[PDB]
RNA sequence: GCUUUACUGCAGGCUGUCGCUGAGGACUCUCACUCCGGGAGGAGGACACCGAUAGCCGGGCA
RNA sequence: ACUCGUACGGUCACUGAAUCCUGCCCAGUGCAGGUAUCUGAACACCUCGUACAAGAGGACGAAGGACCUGUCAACGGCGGG
RNA sequence: AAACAUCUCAGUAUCGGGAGGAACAGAAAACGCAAUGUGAUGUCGUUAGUAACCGCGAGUGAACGCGAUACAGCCCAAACC
């Protein structure tokens, strides 16, 4: 049997790779020696082809010009600050410890220094619940209670572009255009429509999977399709 | 009485005990950041080195060589292969890690030829061996009775022909008696059955 | 069928007719040191191993009598041919 | 559209050109590697034992 | 060529154990080793990774 | 590779616009969770044995299974009297 | 092998690296016609399709020794300077 489509992806051929050369920049926080002195101005508001969300262009004191992840409510001319003693204003990036409890935050660091990792997409946000000298418990958009090093920086506010998901694509044409600007193969042929040779759900006199859809975690790649290690399925119950 | 060498040689009989063990745990740290083929100025095991051919002369070079630990990094068969030849993990090469080291080294130093080699430790994911090479184009050695022979043309690229000491040991040419039926005078003239 | 425990039959050892006790041959243990037990560990490797990959065959509808006939005086036993008996219960 | 006669018409791309090393028209100007002598891939002339019979 | 609860295998996943590997049936610590950090240092810590072995699964493959 | 990506995500599958709806079955098969007890390999540990070794036996016991639960918009089912 | 998985084809075909005019091997931690015996290594003849291996199936298959060819023997390490 030939390799299934999921295996082709792993090679990282052109068809599957993301259009990097077309992308703008990796949105990371600013590395400050210390002091918190670092502050800049919002020059413009652009659209990041990589996240479909907006982005803010900023110019600091020391000459630095770097595009940053634009939360909601930031405009041209405004002022942002990066550091330990930064003001608690929307957009200002600072460690979790300095941030008061119950405030919506985005672009949270998974480890201090990495430059952000959590809460980055359209209109999402984390939630700072607890404080300690050792821990800092954050509520990630998925609802999980992430325990974090209070030294990890995070931006105040919710990510802009909220409400994108709300309106349907309406037509194949529009989806096509979204996907072209991503490293995803599109469209998608259901494995049950393929031949016996091309995918486990293939073949048969009609369209149906011969094997039960759920499948073990331990299964080798090439067979790992369908409902993976499902803790259950359906909605009923 | 016992020479200074005999101490180094004894210390190395149990590299996990005493001062040597305290030494290994140190160096190894610095050894893991070092490249594959590194030229060191002096033999770690001076005794063994000398006992293999080492001399503090011009044209005598030493070097440490680090190799990944393991079994056959053999790729799985793509075409039809019966159950017996279906191995990838288990089967191992017929060439020992020490010999692999000698080659990586001889290559790194093209013009030089390989005298001998010896182990100098190993951790959980690599083994080290030092290598004694000689510059057969240097008058010091062309004139040195004790090493002269290495210049002979028919000694060129010897490590690759298995002519090392570690080579003959790998080829099963130790005992001149029983067992050597299939190895002497060479593996190829015996149809490769050892 | 039924078969008595002790009965007077001829023993090929002392050379005469005396009382013979009938006992069922009990399986003696394997050492794991025989030649077939050293070849199993030898010939076995990657993939198929030939005969060592052969699992137990089968059963016949009725087994023959596997017995030992131990005499009373000398104490020696003798193996005799077997007949197809579904069950063999001794009397006393 | 047949792969035959009709698809012969587009064939006007250049590929194998005169190899500087061996002198054959086997220098793939898109790969810059010779199919014959191997110039561009190996410093050693490409040669295989199957270019002739086994006992030869 | 394809399939499977056909025979025998193999990758692969899970798991015990061996080594890497150190200090005082549950626990502390740091020095190996890991990761982040430009650095100072931060996090993990004899675990993880990797080499060996053992049992289970194993048409993804032969 | 995905990824200059971070759950309003990207992966894996099924169904295939809107509209009205989508019943009952977890027995079997599958996946997932638990599990007193039961089953369960090798090293180390014990006895036996061998001046050593082969080998016999004991104790402990992981994943897995037995056993219980969950789950069908999971494979699939929805009869006879 | 009258299928076929060990086995066979076969360490063959093919691939990677390399030397010379020839290569390789080589002066016993050897042989074990057990001896009061032989005395580096190739190669030729023989031992011999013998011993040994093998779903003990098909098939695979040496050595010591003898008879010849050609013969040849050496140097470090360390002790002590
Ligand atoms: Cl999408
Ligand atoms: Cl060499
Ligand atoms: Cl009986
Ligand atoms: Cl003789
Ligand atoms: K075969
Ligand atoms: Mg990034
Ligand atoms: Mg949707
Ligand atoms: Mg794409
Ligand atoms: Mg589709
Ligand atoms: Mg079709
Ligand atoms: Mg299939
Ligand atoms: Mg259908
Ligand atoms: Mg269907
Ligand atoms: Mg096997
Ligand atoms: Mg890194
Ligand atoms: Mg098949
Ligand atoms: Mg020869
Ligand atoms: Mg047969
Ligand atoms: Mg053979
Ligand atoms: Mg002999
Ligand atoms: Na199907
Ligand atoms: Na060389
Ligand atoms: Na052999
Ligand atoms: Na053997
Ligand atoms: Na076919
Ligand atoms: Na059921
Ligand atoms: Na069920
Ligand atoms: Na045949
Ligand atoms: Na056939
Ligand atoms: Na004789
Ligand atoms: Na066989």
PDB file of C-alpha atoms (C1' of nucleotides) and ligand atoms in Angstrom, chain G residues 8-11 60, ligand 19:
ATOM      1  C1'   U G   8      19.739 -22.958  -0.957  1.00  0.00           C
ATOM      2  C1'   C G   9      21.102 -19.308  -4.916  1.00  0.00           C
ATOM      3  C1'   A G  10      25.373 -16.686  -1.793  1.00  0.00           C
ATOM      4  C1'   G G  11      28.892 -13.647   1.106  1.00  0.00           C
ATOM      5  C1'   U G  60      27.042 -26.888   2.773  1.00  0.00           C
TER       6        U G  60
HETATM    7 MG1  LIG H  19      27.610 -20.973   2.728  1.00  0.00          MG
END
